[PDB]
Amino acid sequence: SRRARIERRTRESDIVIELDLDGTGQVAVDTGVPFYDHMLTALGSHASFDLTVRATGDVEIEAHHTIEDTAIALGTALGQALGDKRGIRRFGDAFIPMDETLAHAAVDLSGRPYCVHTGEPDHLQHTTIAGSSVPYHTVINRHVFESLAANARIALHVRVLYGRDPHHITEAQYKAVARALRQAVEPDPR
Amino acid sequence: SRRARIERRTRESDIVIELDLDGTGQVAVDTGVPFYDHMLTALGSHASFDLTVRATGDVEIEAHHTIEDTAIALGTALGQALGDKRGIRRFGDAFIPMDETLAHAAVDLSGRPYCVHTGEPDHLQHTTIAGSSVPYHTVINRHVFESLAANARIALHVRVLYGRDPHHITEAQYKAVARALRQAVEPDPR
Amino acid sequence: SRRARIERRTRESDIVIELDLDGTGQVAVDTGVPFYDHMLTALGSHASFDLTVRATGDVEIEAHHTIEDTAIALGTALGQALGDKRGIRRFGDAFIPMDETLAHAAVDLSGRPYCVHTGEPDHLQHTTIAGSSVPYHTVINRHVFESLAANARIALHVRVLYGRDPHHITEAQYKAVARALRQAVEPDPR
Amino acid sequence: SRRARIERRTRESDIVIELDLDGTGQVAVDTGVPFYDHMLTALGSHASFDLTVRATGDVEIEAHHTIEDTAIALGTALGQALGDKRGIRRFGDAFIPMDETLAHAAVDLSGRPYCVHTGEPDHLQHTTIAGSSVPYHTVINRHVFESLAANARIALHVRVLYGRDPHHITEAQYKAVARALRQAVEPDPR
Amino acid sequence: SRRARIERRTRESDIVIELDLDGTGQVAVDTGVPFYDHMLTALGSHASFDLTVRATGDVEIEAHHTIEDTAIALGTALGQALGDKRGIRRFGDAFIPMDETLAHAAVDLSGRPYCVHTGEPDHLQHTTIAGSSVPYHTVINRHVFESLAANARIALHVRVLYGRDPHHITEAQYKAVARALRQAVEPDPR
Amino acid sequence: SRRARIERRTRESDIVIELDLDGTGQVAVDTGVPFYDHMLTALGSHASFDLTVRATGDVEIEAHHTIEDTAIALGTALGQALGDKRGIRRFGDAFIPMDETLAHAAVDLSGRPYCVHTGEPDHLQHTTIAGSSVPYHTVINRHVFESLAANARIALHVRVLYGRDPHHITEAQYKAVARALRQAVEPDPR
């Protein structure tokens, strides 16, 4: 079994992650940042992980610290769950069309952090996705992928080929990471 | 079983489609537009569909009306055959090299029409592929992919990375759509 | 003697080639594509080959498949006829002026496919030469030279220095290939 | 079984290839060019081939002749091992992230040579990878992929999306070719 | 008979050339610079010369002095062997395709040194061809052709039309010079 | 025998041409324009023609009328001497290096006038070559080649690849035409 439980308590946040790589998309995410909840639920579900995330942090400041602590904890869990990485596909990639948006992610697990994020339209460096709760600043997308890659110790390449809507651009990237991971972690029959 | 029979009779054309998603590439296409017959035969065959298409239309005008009515009928059949889309991979993509040409298609079935067509060389907006019968104006390629996507209610992204020969560029795109669909419709074991 | 007979039967076409390198320009070509017949007759004749080509293919679609299958079969015949390539000039080149057009070809037989096609005016990527029969799309010129080179296993460099008329540009290139081959295949007295 | 043994003895080199497409990555390569040994070992291993390569050539001149003769022999072996290509996926592609580098390869086996190599940074046309033995001039990468494609009679498209380190750029391309081939040669269950 | 033996002993090198213009390509070259050995062997052989070159020089410094002294000695031998140049074609030219590379040389013997070298890609001014022995700096190509022309007292025009690989670009130029010389030195029957 | 005698008497000039295509370069030219005498002597001699030209014209005006009448008469003689053009090479080309200058000419005899003149440096449109007699305005070079081609009824393509000295540029073009004609008129043994 490829399960990990990570507890991460900092001055800024309190995180619990329970991750199973060999899941059916049983996913529950509650961080206090509802758009981030949606993105991590999409990630767990499209990866066919079982994933629970419970995070409380300093959202009076903004989402950044909670988002980052969550991504660090989640990456740590992914790395621990992967163990020796013996017998897995190792390489994975996925294209995700979302209406006008096309995103792609490619991964190499096998143990050296690296993240390359390209093609995200420049308006996403100062876009806010806002509802009735704590908002999500899309400039953080890159930071989430970097933190994941750095703590899981994997190579993660995330690309936006084109798109316009910041919700479509963001969600397609999270889904692309998710399906790339799904393919990479699967047993390689050879 | 994931089969559909569509009959579409308009002022301009008369179409019958019999489609099975779970096929072995048993394909017979007769539209009166032989290059289109070739492209739809390539599509059915590379998708591992069973597909029969019988169309008669107003080819004295040109192929456009028959091509469009056929693509609408075929997309309708694909949507009906997909039913609830329960348990399928949903996402699919395929690269197709054809000598100098590289084409790509990515699909998301799961229920909102969208089509993005990019990178086709500009000479394909006024190219004719002509033999001894009704010719095929390559400007129609985009129209075929749009009509398919709109009537199957799927997201279809078709890209030409590079190429020169209009037959290679056209056929690689039809084949790319076909293999992307093949992957997307397949049962997802998870 | 440097003779080869190639029969090539595909789903798309039926080809018979009889080639003698040591000929007097006794040439008969019938492919169902009369401008291609003219170009291959010019090639056989200006190479001082004896050449018969009988091809029937799917010209209801367009000339492409028949043209390509013919060029593959012809290149195969050229390679077989050349045998060990012992004692031949190996290198050949020819300039062909045709009114306003100047074309050139250079060849190296001795056994590694390579084709470089340069300087053809851009209007030839979407030009049609049309008469009362199956038309010829000049974009195919490059494809013919590539298929020949790849199946004869020779280096073929075809250049258009300048020109305007697509018939002159096309015919001068076929003639240039023909005279370059003629020189390359001839016994080298040293 | 899909095995081939090729012996190729030229004025410049002496090659023996034993190739099994249906392997477990049992790979032994010795050419006298240790970086090339590494690249061909990566290729055999990531393709899940069993592969032995023993080559001795004129490395006093430089690696080029031995590298080229090896790639020709290896491509010949791949083509022979593939036989009729009945029942295989035929199409394959793979993305390979290697730290900062992202490379891609796409293949079509089914029987016409073609190679398109794009996006390799210009500094790789005059880069040397040098250790204590015979060095490797990265300008040869393109030549290796061309020779492989031409002798296996396949379409091979190799792309560098981006990268900096010439070892990462080179190794990611060899690995991408390897995983694309792996997917293409696998039995297609349909 | 058109034979010359040149001995050239300098502070830097020791050269012996035996040249016969009316040869069969009986060629033996040993300079201590194996890529140069290969280029001069190609030159002698493609010119249908009989040629022996034995050179020892200061290769601890680099190949330059030995290469230059050899080219001077060889040019001197070519000039002496040509004698009165009575009854020869005088003018010669040759195109040499080498995979992606096309090179050309044109010569006028009849008695005034001149060398024009054009079209060599700029990367060849700082490229090294390196094996297990003394390497070859391609910037020297021009110097070799200049030294040959100046000491044989001939006009030599060497052109690279296009190419990429520095070994193909260099070898095609040496072969082009060789076949141009072959044609120029041959008896003119008129 | 391929001989012609042309007498051309106009208001401006009096011309006699005796031409033998199958000559040994027995050439005598006297037009009253000594640089033109030199160019036509070079042409006759390098073509291996036997050629006598006696022209007297209105050189008080300038050389133009005499030069043009001579070129018309000479072209007429070349056409008449060629007769049916049965059994000849038909195509000919020649490169001529002259110190810094490289010129080329290509010819097709077989019966439709055409002349393309390219690459002559712009300073040759207003250059004078002057001695102690009637001078030669190099702008006339093009006119001479046009008049020759038009009256012999041949395709003549003359190119200057590069050069500086107007005497070298002019003389290399006349010599290139001469050697191209020599090759084209020779019996083709096939």
Ligand SMILES: CC(C)[C@H](N)c1ncnn1C
């Ligand atoms: C100690 C951490 C929470 C710091 N204030 C921070 N803000 C944004 N990124 N980081 C590291």
Ligand SMILES: CC(C)[C@H](N)c1ncnn1C
């Ligand atoms: C009613 C239809 C056949 C119409 N003339 C048309 N031409 C091209 N596209 N459409 C919709």
Ligand SMILES: CC(C)[C@H](N)c1ncnn1C
């Ligand atoms: C199987 C062949 C005939 C294919 N449809 C094609 N069209 C154009 N080139 N090719 C290979």
Ligand SMILES: CC(C)[C@H](N)c1ncnn1C
């Ligand atoms: C005969 C071969 C070994 C030739 N010298 C060469 N060098 C580089 N490529 N090639 C074909």
Ligand SMILES: CC(C)[C@H](N)c1ncnn1C
């Ligand atoms: C005396 C010679 C050998 C001199 N050092 C030199 N190096 C490179 N070219 N030259 C002439």
Ligand SMILES: CC(C)[C@H](N)c1ncnn1C
């Ligand atoms: C009648 C002729 C001699 C006329 N003046 C002329 N000058 C230059 N070219 N031409 C035709």
Ligand SMILES: [Cl-]
């Ligand atoms: Cl891509």
Ligand SMILES: [Cl-]
């Ligand atoms: Cl040229």
Ligand SMILES: [Mn+2]
């Ligand atoms: Mn941070």
Ligand SMILES: [Mn+2]
């Ligand atoms: Mn959403």
Ligand SMILES: [Mn+2]
């Ligand atoms: Mn329409």
Ligand SMILES: [Mn+2]
């Ligand atoms: Mn086709």
Ligand SMILES: [Mn+2]
């Ligand atoms: Mn084709």
Ligand SMILES: [Mn+2]
């Ligand atoms: Mn014609």
Ligand SMILES: [Mn+2]
């Ligand atoms: Mn090579």
Ligand SMILES: [Mn+2]
């Ligand atoms: Mn490595």
